[PDB]
Design a protein around this nucleic acid. Structure first.
Ligand SMILES: [Mg+2]
Ligand SMILES: [Mg+2]
Ligand SMILES: [Mg+2]
Length: 150
RNA sequence: AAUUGAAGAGUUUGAUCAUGGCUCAGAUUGAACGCUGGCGGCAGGCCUAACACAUGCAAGUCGAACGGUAACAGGAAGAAG
């Protein structure tokens, strides 16, 4: 149950006396399938180097999120830089409908049946990230009782 | 049981993030045109000039309201084919 997938691979340019020196960047997401998900970025002069150098970063850099069986407990909003993301429980019929790129984090995460949309820029590096922190801030469908009960 | 349902992509930059317009995937149509074209079922068919219109047809019916016979039908004292 490794389960991983890269979301966006891109090229960039550095520019020096001798001209442009190009490079690449991968952005990836690994999840266990039962909560626990992280993303990694990582960049390198050539693509395979970078997509791999990324996968690892994600293995570390990994949060975990309090699911509720196949779905989220309540609805949540996430918002990093220019991306404002919103995703919702959805008493699954099928579900998992969302902006491929946050479908990525959502399935490896293990959510099985949510609807989402991304507002603002769909800049991958900031959505997959806005959603993570999104799922992250999410909270205990029980241990709000922790907070209260008391 | 009976609205229990939401995706994003391309494009300013050497490159970047943002701002932002343009653009695309969708569905829908009383449609036209180019190419092509076998059959059926249900449907639709002047969106323009409330422009103008030849011709037929689109409102008649009742003799159980009435005087009635001109048509075609029988029939009639009776005049006969
Ligand atoms: Mg970093
Ligand atoms: Mg260019
Ligand atoms: Mg033809």
């Amino acid at each position: 149950e490794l389960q991983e997938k890269l979301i966006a691979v891109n090229r960039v340019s550095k520019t020096v006396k001798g001209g442009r020196i190009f490079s690449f960047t991968a952005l990836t997401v690994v999840g266990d399938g039962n909560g626990r998900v992280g993303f990694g970025y990582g960049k390198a002069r050539e693509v395979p180097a970078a997509i791999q150098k990324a996968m690892e970063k994600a293995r570390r850099n990994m949060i975990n999120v309090a699911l509720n069986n196949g779905t989220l407990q309540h609805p949540v909003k996430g918002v990093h830089t220019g991306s404002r993301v919103f995703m919702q429980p959805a008493s699954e019929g099928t579900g998992i409908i969302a902006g491929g790129a946050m479908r990525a984090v959502l399935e490896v995460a293990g959510v099985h049946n949510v609807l989402a949309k991304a507002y603002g820029s769909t800049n991958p590096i900031n959505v997959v990230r806005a959603t993570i922190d999104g799922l992250e801030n999410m909270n205990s469908p029980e241990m709000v009782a922790a907070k209260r009960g008391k």
